[PDB]
Amino acid sequence: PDSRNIFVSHRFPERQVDLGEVVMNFAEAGSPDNPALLLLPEQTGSWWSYEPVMGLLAENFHVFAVDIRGQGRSTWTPRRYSLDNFGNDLVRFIALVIKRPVVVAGNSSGGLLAAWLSAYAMPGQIRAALCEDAPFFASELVPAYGHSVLQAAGPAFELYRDFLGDQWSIGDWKGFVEAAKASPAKAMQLFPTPDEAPQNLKEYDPEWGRAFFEGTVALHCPHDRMLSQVKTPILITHHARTIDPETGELLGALSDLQAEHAQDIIRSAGVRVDYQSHPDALHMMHLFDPARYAEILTSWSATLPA
Amino acid sequence: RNIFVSHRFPERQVDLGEVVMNFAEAGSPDNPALLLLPEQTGSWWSYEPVMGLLAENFHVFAVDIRGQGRSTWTPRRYSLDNFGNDLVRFIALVIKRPVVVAGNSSGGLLAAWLSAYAMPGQIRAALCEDAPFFASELVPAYGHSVLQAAGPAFELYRDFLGDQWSIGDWKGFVEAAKASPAKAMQLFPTPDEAPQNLKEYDPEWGRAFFEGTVALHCPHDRMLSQVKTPILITHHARTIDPETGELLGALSDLQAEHAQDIIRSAGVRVDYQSHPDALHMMHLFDPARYAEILTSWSATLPANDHHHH
Ligand SMILES: C[C@H]1CCCC(=O)CCC/C=C/c2cc(O)cc(O)c2C(=O)N1
Ligand SMILES: C[C@H]1CCCC(=O)CCC/C=C/c2cc(O)cc(O)c2C(=O)N1
């Protein structure tokens, strides 16, 4: 994987654009007369996390699915992984490639960035943001509310750092898998441990995981302040989540309490916010139940002002 | 936040999205565009005495960086990357042409930031006026850290003025400054009343430098390795105290030598001028000299003719 020559074929053509520091890879679907839709993957996911759902969304949207920096065919940038750098790359992407206002939809950390764009993009760039099971608060080191990253997804990111290493400099996949299987963190059960590293992980810069676990990725983007600054309608979907009865760990993206405060803050900013709890859905609904995801996204987007 | 004073160039503001950025414009768009970045604690009008000279030959934009002047104060969001992307947006939304960027001190850091990290084609060239490469980092690759240079002053901005002037203990700041063991404290204003520039300054800037958060995600050795335009480095007064080892000045000879080396190994044009008797803010305290440095160097840039009309 530190070859950066490990890529495979996909169903939609891919194109790259120079944003200045990062060269961003992306795939396009749908017809350009339809409203623009920017799709942001989960951490460890390339644009083609959205490949099964892109055909469905192609019926109604002009779809751009991107590799975020440090993922896929987009530039890996050591020591530069922050929500602000991720977000400003996407501001540049809209300005250089799309050149229209977008609906932005993001899963997990991509949902953090969907909110980031609502608050901090260039004026007019963002019509609305869909935050698909975004770990508001629970992906911070010291959140204003609820479980920290250390008490939720952190243990997996720690193992990415310790065994895969920055830019796959260590690459001990077998040691990662044996450490993951031996971990006493119940949340580890939500992460794949196949016999060989899966394609999405070979495209992933594990310094992402370091930055989340060490609390550097969002040091300059406290979530309570970010959510208070959003400027567009927001849709929050909230998928599976439980509190482990033996460790107290959060299993899922964010707890009910965290979701309640996220809504409250957005509402206090005076922007439209809608919340949908889908407690039996998997974290990556856009991948594992694309028809349900597409319906949610399409139906909501139809309620947006023109 | 209503302590502003008049100035001899009209000021305007532009919404960048998060930051509303204040700036002063002078000159004709027929001449090359020039973006002026102040030092930390300096508003755009740090350049007000020299802009008349520069407006003879340049279309000048002098800006208030986020957390300074009339530009939005943004609690907890002070980083070189956020400062830098604001300026990327400013060029894209206001200037709409390639620019020469000239910055003093932290503004010089940001000029190099733009050279490396702006959108393609935005930056023609960067003038880094006594920029504290390495010396303004918490863990620099080379030489003094901020803790052995300007840090003690920023520490006192944090401790006595506070984030967004939330403490505001100017008297106690002055008293602590005078009592400081740091020889470098003599380089900072300690008047009996807070000066105008500092009333316009968000001291969380100082916190961010002292605590090593402002450039956590922008190590300077890597930044300098990624520059993509010609760079002019001016290096003004500096000495290293023989008793404490403190750096008095923006950067040491060792730090300037590595900065040059790194830029040159990026394969771009780099020029270095040592002005060991110049004050840190030469653009303010020796404006005629500074204007001649910038103008004469700009005239040697490729496409200087294309940018005249
Ligand atoms: C890798 C991606 C895969 C999801 C693995 C899980 O289903 C665990 C529960 C959901 C939380 C994930 C999660 C937390 C976080 O604090 C930061 C992140 O980027 C994610 C994030 O993107 N996970
Ligand atoms: C306040 C402004 C003016 C104070 C200048 C001095 O006379 C001290 C000399 C060294 C440079 C300061 C300096 C260091 C740094 O690590 C980061 C910075 O932004 C400055 C910076 O902009 N100083």
Author numbering:
A (entry chain B): 21 to 326
B (entry chain A): 24 to 332
How did the manuscript describe this experimental structure?
Zearalenone (ZEN) is a mycoestrogenic polyketide produced by Fusarium graminearum and other phytopathogenic members of the genus Fusarium. ZenA cleaves zearalenone [ZEN, (S,E)-14,16-dihydroxy-3-methyl-3,4,5,6,9,10-hexahydro-1H-benzo[c]oxacyclotetradecine-1,7(8H)-dione] to hydrolyzed zearalenone [HZEN, (S,E)-2,4-dihydroxy-6-(10-hydroxy-6-oxoundec-1-en-1-yl)benzoic acid], which decarboxylates spontaneously to decarboxylated hydrolyzed zearalenone [DHZEN, (S,E)-1-(3,5-dihydroxyphenyl)-10-hydroxyundec-1-en-6-one]. Furthermore, we report site-directed mutagenesis as well as structural analysis of the dimeric ZenARe of R. erythropolis and the more thermostable, tetrameric ZenAScfl of Streptomyces coelicoflavus with and without bound ligands. The X-ray crystal structures not only revealed canonical features of α/β hydrolases with a cap domain including a Ser-His-Asp catalytic triad but also unusual features including an uncommon oxyanion hole motif and a peripheral, short antiparallel β-sheet involved in tetramer interactions.
As inactivation of ZenAScfl by substituting the catalytic His-286 with tyrosine (H286Y) caused conformational changes at the active site, we attempted to get structural information with a bound, noncleavable substrate analogue. A derivative of ZEN, which is a cyclic amide rather than a cyclic carboxylic ester, was synthesized. In line with proposed nomenclature guidelines, we called the molecule zearalactamenone (ZLAEN). The ligand was found at the active site of ZenARe, and the resorcylic acid moiety was in the same position as the one of HZEN in ZenAScfl H286Y. Most of the structure of ZenARe remained unchanged upon binding of ZLAEN. However, the positions of the amino acids Met-208 – Pro-214 at the lip of the cap were shifted upon binding. The biggest movements were observed for Leu-210, where Cα was shifted by 4.4 Å and CD by 6.7 Å, and Phe-211, where the Cα was shifted by 3.1 Å, and side-chain atoms were shifted by up to 5.8 Å. The nucleophilic Ser-112 appeared in the same orientation as in the unbound structure, forming a hydrogen bond with N21 of ZLAEN at a distance of 3.5 Å. The side-chain amide of Gln-63 formed a hydrogen bond of 2.8 Å with the hydroxyl group connected to C-16 of ZLAEN. However, crystal structure analysis revealed that only ZenARe underwent a structural change resembling enzyme closure, with residues in the cap’s lip adopting a more closed conformation of the ZEN-binding pocket.
